[PDB]
Design a protein around this ligand. Structure first.
Ligand SMILES: Nc1nc2c(ncn2[C@@H]2O[C@H](COP(=O)(O)OP(=O)(O)O[C@H]3O[C@@H]([C@H](O)CO)[C@H](O)[C@@H](O)[C@@H]3O)[C@@H](O)[C@H]2O)c(=O)[nH]1
Ligand SMILES: Nc1nc2c(ncn2[C@@H]2O[C@H](COP(=O)(O)OP(=O)(O)O[C@H]3O[C@@H]([C@H](O)CO)[C@H](O)[C@@H](O)[C@@H]3O)[C@@H](O)[C@H]2O)c(=O)[nH]1
Lengths: 179, 179
């Protein structure tokens, strides 16, 4: 049988961003795979800080969500249906790579989970008809909702993300940040 | 801004099976929702038994997986893409409802998360073109893989489940159960 395996490597662009590739069992039915075990992936986050919250974000084609982060939250993110351009921005003002970025195109053929430490910009664009984005959160205290998060404009010129469109679907939050 | 909520109901058919319905933030982009927090949902399993394992199962139209269980795993399951016929079977030998079953028809339009204690039969049938099934596991010690699990035939006449097909796509494991 297959053991649960995770390939783990750090980004060559953004210090403290990890790229995790699970193995999969494939057969005539489809696929089974493990996104997370405490035993293997709890080490991606400091001791005392627990993955205690799981979310799904379901978005249509051409939706762009971002760029969003908060001071508290370690994020393990992936796309479990469809295809997203996942873009991590370095939003640590102290970092020598502040406002550098790296793209992961996550889909049926590239199943990566991306580990974001706090003070990072998270963003994704939906290149498939629809996308199911899976989002694990590790944080102390209460959930950091939108009023406690920071926002950079998806198209901030200082960041210069290569997006597949100039005309994404945006929430009012993400529109407001472009002005 | 929305507070995270869970409607938590006990099954009227199978004691110790709970139906958890999250609320969702719906906007022009699609939806955002919480499947799990340690706070709200750790109280539905014994003290010292932790949800520590996250699985995704992607299946084609007409796949049936089941009926499967093991002696120690608590399971939280839903369908996050497409639609499944989710069937829980009471496989607790001493239970008054042994081999009774209950069906749920789960999709983003009916976002039920089903909590199964150990010694239950879990099964799903994909009625959509494809489905993604999200599976969270609470257990002590090591994972019970297929060889450490039990199996009941999907079409076992003592259970008598109504399925929308006589010709599901099955693993050799699930065909073997029908002999
Ligand atoms: N019922 C329910 N409602 C929820 C939930 N989460 C947020 N909400 C509500 O959704 C609304 C929109 O919340 P937003 O946080 O602005 O949604 P958003 O999807 O635009 O932003 C999200 O973007 C992510 C990335 O940038 C893209 O992958 C960030 O990782 C994440 O931290 C951020 O929350 C708010 O009103 C909030 O209170 C939830 O889990 N349940
Ligand atoms: N790489 C990787 N491989 C995994 C994994 N899980 C199982 N496998 C392997 O997939 C193969 C098939 O595993 P099975 O356990 O028979 O898959 P299955 O999808 O037929 O069975 C599953 O069915 C569920 C319900 O009945 C339907 O929702 C049960 O609740 C669940 O406990 C059971 O494992 C085995 O070789 C196993 O070692 C995994 O997480 N990663």
């Amino acid at each position: 049988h297959m053991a649960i395996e995770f390939d783990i490597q750090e980004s060559k662009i953004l210090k403290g961003v990890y790229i995790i590739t699970p193995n999969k069992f494939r057969d005539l039915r489809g696929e089974i795979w493990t996104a997370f075990t405490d035993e293997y992936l709890s080490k991606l986050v400091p001791d005392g800080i627990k993955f205690k919250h799981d979310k799904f974000i379901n978005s249509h084609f051409n939706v762009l969500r971002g760029i969003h982060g908060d001071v508290k939250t370690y994020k393990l993110v992936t796309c479990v249906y469809g295809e997203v351009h996942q873009v991590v921005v370095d939003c640590r003002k102290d970092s020598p790579t502040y406002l550098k970025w790296e793209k992961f195109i996550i889909s049926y053929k590239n199943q990566q989970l991306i580990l974001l430490p706090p003070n990072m910009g998270n963003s994704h664009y939906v290149s498939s008809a629809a996308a199911v984005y899976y989002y694990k959160l590790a944080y102390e205290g209460e959930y950091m909702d939108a009023p406690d998060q920071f926002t950079y404009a998806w198209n901030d010129e200082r960041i210069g993300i290569d997006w597949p469109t100039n005309t994404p679907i945006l929430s009012d939050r993400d529109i407001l940040a472009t002005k």
